[PDB]
Design a protein around this ligand. Structure first.
Ligand SMILES: CCCCCCCCCCCCCCCCCC(=O)OC[C@H](COP(=O)([O-])OCC(O)COP(=O)([O-])OC[C@@H](COC(=O)CCCCCCCCCCCCCCCCC)OC(=O)CCCCCCCCCCCCCCCCC)OC(=O)CCCCCCCCCCCCCCCCC
Ligand SMILES: CCCCCCCCCCCCCCCCCC(=O)OC[C@H](COP(=O)([O-])OCC(O)COP(=O)([O-])OC[C@@H](COC(=O)CCCCCCCCCCCCCCCCC)OC(=O)CCCCCCCCCCCCCCCCC)OC(=O)CCCCCCCCCCCCCCCCC
Ligand SMILES: CCCCCCCCCCCCCCCCCC(=O)OC[C@H](COP(=O)([O-])OCC(O)COP(=O)([O-])OC[C@@H](COC(=O)CCCCCCCCCCCCCCCCC)OC(=O)CCCCCCCCCCCCCCCCC)OC(=O)CCCCCCCCCCCCCCCCC
Ligand SMILES: CCCCCCCCCCCCCCCC(=O)OC[C@H](COP(=O)(O)OCCN)OC(=O)CCCCCCCCCCCCCCC
Ligand SMILES: CCCCCCCCCCCCCCCCCC(=O)OC[C@H](COP(=O)(O)OCCN)OC(=O)CCCCCCCCCCCCC
Ligand SMILES: CCCCCCCCCCCCCC(=O)OC[C@H](COP(=O)(O)OCC[N+](C)(C)C)OC(=O)CCCCCCCCCCCCC
Ligand code: HEM
Ligand code: HEM
Ligand SMILES: CCCCCC(=O)OC[C@H](COP(=O)([O-])OCCN)OC(=O)CCCCC
Ligand SMILES: CCCCCC(=O)OC[C@H](COP(=O)([O-])OCCN)OC(=O)CCCCC
Ligand SMILES: CCCCCC(=O)OC[C@H](COP(=O)([O-])OCCN)OC(=O)CCCCC
Ligand SMILES: CSC1=N[C@@](C)(c2ccccc2)C(=O)N1Nc1ccccc1
Ligand SMILES: [Cl-]
Lengths: 105, 48, 377, 49, 61, 50, 50
């Protein structure tokens, strides 16, 4: 909407490229630490996203073993990073918080 | 104070020479076995 | 197939052969087995020293001399045992640093007993360094045991009860030798429980992401890498044994213990200097002791301070910098600990001492919260 | 050509083609438990022999 | 098309594990003599006339 | 007890005989080399010395 | 973290309170008895002696 919230994105694009998981062809949600909430969200993914997530992670563990990265052409662009897991994950948390609010009635 | 001085250096020489042999040979055995993995190629072929 | 059904070889199989392991664990994962090797070396060199060592003040100094001069190849056994202990502490500190950088502490059970494995090794090497009964052995033993006198009410009773007298003397050297003999076997037992809890989950890896999609068998891939690593461990040890045996040892320990005067400046072995610095950074008795205990027991509450939605620091630049400021800060405290309580080393020792606890307790927890918000989650 | 074959013949012929030779492997399906190629390759000889 | 030395070593020594192990133990035996022989020869050529092996001839009687 | 004496078991014996006699050469040579048994090592030409 | 503050959790606290204060009496009395803590054991009448 403005120029101030636009360099805010510029420093988030900066941190994104510095974090460097896009150099392994990975997306932000591929790097989330699996807890009980996350393991449930992954369980709920449709077959296409689950299989894609499996291969991207497998491709990255392969690269990490060789201490290599993908060509710059194949890095995950900050603009094209689909937060595919947070919708499922946010509903998992929402359900858990409901149980927790009932548990103290 | 150190009567073992001369003998330890003679051993030290033998230790360096054996290491100069064994380190690259053991390194070569590691690379030999691991080469199956280091040159493996992956492909993803999902149904469409 | 008998390898999978014999009740004895079953447990070996599921731990060293067919155990699934990640395909991408780096050299920082080699230090687990090097700790085991270090332990085995300290058992064997230790055992063969105990066949010629005597445990009483009159001839304790002389029996070690007797080994380095008269028994066949005992001088090499003795420096292996002395430098093996220092290699043990190198591997310990890499092992822990690996766990912090890559987030392996989330294995609570494995991690929390790992802390116990750290304390017992320190207690071992402490009671090992007393046995030759040199000057550093005696007064280093005096400073440490008096830490318990700081406990209110029951302090002095525990010290004199540990001592078996009114100061470290014949009665302490005998029991310390008994403790130094038996503790490395307790360590091996707890190291087995270390692995038992570990195998419950398997190894972490440089990325912090589950490696279930891409595992390889431990054999032949990590059996050979652990061999190669061990061969570099022998190299490190033998360079110290055969070309620089007294580099880490202090000269003062080559004069028999004298209970009447101290050296003008005492310094622990390198692997305890960072913690000695924290102790001296406080002009209070009980304060210095508590700051020393929390210096190591801080590890037990690292898992409670994890704020990042990611596990490893591989994708967290802001945590990387704070991690290396801790290594430098710890390297600073090591330097102060080796220097006399004098200006400006005193004030430096206090600033580096706050920076230690400030990083772990404040800067690194909040640094993970920032980078979560930079990544919009 | 068959009656010539005895036990000595199969041992000589089999060792010529099987013993300590690099195999080709092909897998399809739920093959997570398919042994790694180095393990397969080590199954092509016996340390007792 | 005579097989190189590495191929003739495999066919004769290495294919069988037993012969592969026999030549390791024999290889150790002959390697030990020539290694300690040659190694000691270097250690003293560096330190020529510095230790007792060299000045033993002065104080014979 | 006497399951293992018949045509096939004497064939297995004669198949593994060349191998076991070689592992006896590994052990025997390995015992000489490890213990520095001088009674044997004098007739072999090159190692004679020291 | 704050899952455990609400109507039901304060009821559980008040249910197990009488028990925990008794296990503190076991431990405290057990600590006095094992270590022979004389500062406490003087006011209790009968054990006074030796
Ligand atoms: C001896 C002390 C050495 C201290 C270790 C320094 C770091 C290192 O290189 O580790 C090597 C080695 C490589 O392991 P890795 O699995 O390939 O990568 C580990 C990290 O992920 C590595 O992290 P990274 O992926 O971000 O890369 C860091 C980079 C670091 O590279 C360098 O800094 C070397 C630059 C020297 C250039 C040549 C100038 C001469 O590592 C390398 O490229 C391999 C070192 C190549 C050495 C060549 C020397 C000639 O790691 C270790 O062994 C760490 C423990 C060493 C402590 C030994 C003390 C006893
Ligand atoms: C206390 C003891 C601590 C024990 C640490 C445990 C280390 C361990 O178990 O893993 C070894 C771990 C194995 O590395 P790797 O299997 O080659 O795989 C490395 C990655 O794939 C990375 O792939 P990469 O293509 O980036 O590899 C770079 C290449 C290093 O690239 C170079 O060529 C640098 C050398 C510059 C020399 C220039 C002359 C021309 O390899 C290395 O980084 C190893 C450096 C060792 C150089 C020794 C000289 C040969 O890294 C090492 O430190 C190897 C040292 C072995 C000594 C070889 C001496 C002959
Ligand atoms: C030092 C003590 C040495 C103990 C040697 C034990 C010998 C033995 O058990 O004979 C079995 C073994 C049977 O192997 P095979 O004929 O290839 O048949 C494989 C089976 O069907 C079954 O084959 P598999 O596919 O089920 O298993 C393959 C197995 C085959 O290799 C073994 O079974 C070796 C057993 C572990 C020995 C540990 C060495 C220390 O390789 C391993 O899993 C051992 C990996 C050890 C990793 C340890 C990392 C540290 O026979 C020998 O290798 C005897 C020759 C040894 C020469 C002694 C030098 C005088
Ligand atoms: C009951 C048995 C218990 C044994 C327990 C052992 C504990 C493990 C310690 C490992 C120390 C490494 C070698 C130091 C000795 C020395 O330096 O060797 C000195 C001798 C020279 O000696 P010399 O010239 O005096 O005589 C000469 C008479 N001919 O040659 C060497 O340089 C050999 C060392 C080469 C480099 C080391 C490579 C390590 C390989 C792994 C082997 C480990 C086997 C473990 C077996 C249990
Ligand atoms: C409590 C005891 C105090 C005693 C004082 C001891 C004195 C300290 C002396 C300092 C020696 C330092 C050793 C050299 C380290 C070099 C590391 C480096 O070269 O690479 C950085 C590496 C980054 O690599 P990534 O894993 O992110 O991804 C790789 C993509 N190709 O990232 C990593 O590799 C980092 C892994 C962890 C390193 C371990 C070192 C820390 C040692 C003490 C930690 C104690 C904390 C309580
Ligand atoms: C009473 C006195 C008795 C004395 C007896 C003396 C006997 C000496 C040993 C001889 C035994 C040889 C057996 C043998 O080589 O097989 C073991 C494996 C097989 O190697 P590999 O190349 O996999 O397969 C060979 C297949 N073949 C035979 C058909 C060509 O070979 C290897 O893979 C071994 C290579 C690695 C060795 C290092 C292991 C030691 C532990 C780590 C050391 C450093 C830190 C402690
Ligand atoms: C005598 C002491 C110890 C021994 C023998 C030992 C051995 C091992 C071994 C063999 C592994 C698995 C292989 C590896 O990751 O290298 C391991 C993993 C681990 N250890 Fe230790 N260790 C010891 C002390 C410690 C200490 C002091 C800590 C932490 C304060 C610790 C925490 C851990 C953790 C968290 C792991 C899991 C690492 C991972 O899989 O990513 N251990 N240890
Ligand atoms: C993790 C295990 C061990 C560590 C870190 C360790 C460490 C040490 C250290 C640092 C010393 C001082 C050496 C010196 O200043 O000269 C020492 C001495 C000694 N250790 Fe150990 N030790 C271990 C296990 C053992 C075991 C299992 C035994 C016996 C069964 C043993 C027997 C001795 C003896 C007799 C001495 C006195 C001789 C000497 O000073 O060299 N050690 N130990
Ligand atoms: C005294 C001799 C002991 C022999 C040990 C042995 O050979 O173990 C198996 C492997 C090689 O055999 P393989 O894995 O090819 O399997 C062959 C299947 N036919 O070797 C190693 O890599 C193990 C390392 C042991 C270190 C302690
Ligand atoms: C079972 C452990 C064997 C321990 C033997 C020992 O310590 O070494 C002594 C002899 C030395 O050979 P020799 O020619 O001097 O002969 C000296 C004669 N006394 O070596 C031998 O003779 C090896 C014999 C092995 C048989 C099992
Ligand atoms: C944790 C191990 C405790 C070891 C205490 C000990 O050895 O006994 C000493 C005193 C004796 O009581 P006191 O009235 O003589 O008093 C003497 C005062 N110095 O007993 C106590 O005071 C018990 C205190 C326990 C607190 C944890
Ligand atoms: C018992 S003398 C001693 N034991 C060591 C090896 C040790 C102490 C504590 C924990 C583990 C190992 C050490 O550094 N010192 N020296 C020393 C010098 C001054 C003050 C304290 C110790
Ligand atoms: Cl001494």
């Amino acid at each position: 909407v403005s120029a101030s919230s636009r360099w805010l994105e510029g420093i988030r694009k900066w941190y994104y490229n510095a974090a460097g998981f896009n150099k392994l062809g990975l997306m932000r949600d591929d790097t989330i630490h699996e807890n009980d909430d996350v393991k449930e969200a992954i369980r709920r993914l449709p077959e296409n996203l689950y299989n894609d997530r499996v291969f991207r992670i497998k491709r990255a563990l392969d690269l990490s073993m060789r201490q290599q990265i993908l060509p710059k052409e194949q890095w995950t662009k900050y603009e094209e990073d689909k937060s595919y897991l947070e919708p499922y994950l946010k509903e998992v948390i929402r359900e858990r918080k409901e149980r927790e609010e009932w548990a103290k009635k | 104070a150190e009567p073992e001085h001369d003998h330890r250096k003679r051993m030290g020489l033998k230790m360096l020479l054996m290491m100069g042999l064994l380190l690259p040979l053991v390194y070569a055995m590691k690379r030999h076995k691991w080469s199956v993995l280091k040159s493996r190629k992956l492909a993803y072929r999902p149904p469409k | 197939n008998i390898r999978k059904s014999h009740p004895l070889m079953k447990i070996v199989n599921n731990a060293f052969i067919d155990l699934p392991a990640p395909s991408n664990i780096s050299s920082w994962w080699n230090f687990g087995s090097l700790l085991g090797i270090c332990l085995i070396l300290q058992i064997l060199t230790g055992l063969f020293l105990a066949m010629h060592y005597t445990s009483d003040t009159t001839t304790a100094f002389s029996s070690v001399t007797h080994i380095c001069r008269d028994v066949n190849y005992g001088w090499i056994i003795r420096y292996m045992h002395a430098n093996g202990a220092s290699m043990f502490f190198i591997c310990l500190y890499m092992h822990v640093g690996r766990g912090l950088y890559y987030g392996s502490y989330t294995f609570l059970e494995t991690w929390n007993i790992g802390v116990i494995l750290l304390l017992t090794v320190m207690a071992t090497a402490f009671m090992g360094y007393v046995l030759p009964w040199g000057q550093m052995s005696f007064w280093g033993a005096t400073v440490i045991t008096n830490l318990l006198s700081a406990i209110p009410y029951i302090g002095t009773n525990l010290v004199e009860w540990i001592w078996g007298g009114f100061s470290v003397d014949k009665a302490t050297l005998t029991r310390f030798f008994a403790f130094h003999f038996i503790l490395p076997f307790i360590i091996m037992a707890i190291a087995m429980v270390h692995l038992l809890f570990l195998h419950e989950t398997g190894s972490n890896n440089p990325t912090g992401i589950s490696s279930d999609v891409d595992k390889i068998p431990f054999h032949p891939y990590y059996t050979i890498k652990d061999i190669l690593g061990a061969l570099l461990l022998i190299l490190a040890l033998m360079l110290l044994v055969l070309f620089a045996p007294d580099l880490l040892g202090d000269p003062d320990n080559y004069t028999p213990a004298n209970p009447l005067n101290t050296p003008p400046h005492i310094k622990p072995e390198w692997y305890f200097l960072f913690a000695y610095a924290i102790l001296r950074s406080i002009p209070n008795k009980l304060g210095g002791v508590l700051a020393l205990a929390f210096s190591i027991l801080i590890l037990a509450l690292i898992p409670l301070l994890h704020t990042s939605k990611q596990r490893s620091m591989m994708f967290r630049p802001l945590s990387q910098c704070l991690f290396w400021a801790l290594v430098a800060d710890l390297l600073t405290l090591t330097w102060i600990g080796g220097q006399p309580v004098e200006h400006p080393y005193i004030t430096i020792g206090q600033l580096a001492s706050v920076l230690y606890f400030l990083l772990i307790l404040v800067l690194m927890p909040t640094a993970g919260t920032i980078e979560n918000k930079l990544l919009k989650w | 050509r068959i009656a010539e074959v005895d036990a000595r013949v199969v041992r000589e012929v089999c060792s010529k083609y099987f013993y300590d030779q690099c195999p080709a492997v092909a897998g399809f399906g739920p093959i997570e438990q398919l042994p790694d190629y180095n393990r397969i390759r080590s199954g092509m000889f016996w340390l007792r022999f | 098309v005579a097989p190189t030395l590495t191929a003739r070593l495999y066919s004769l020594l290495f294919r069988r594990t037993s012969t592969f192990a026999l030549t390791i133990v024999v290889g150790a035996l002959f390697f030990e003599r020539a290694f300690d022989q040659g190694a000691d020869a270097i250690y003293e050529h560096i330190n020529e006339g510095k230790l007792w092996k060299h000045i033993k001839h002065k104080y014979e009687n | 007890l006497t399951r293992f004496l018949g045509p096939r078991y004497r064939q297995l014996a004669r198949n593994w005989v060349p191998t076991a006699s070689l592992w006896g050469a590994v052990g025997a040579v390995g015992l000489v080399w490890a213990t520095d048994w001088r009674l044997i090592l004098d007739w072999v030409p090159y190692i004679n010395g020291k």
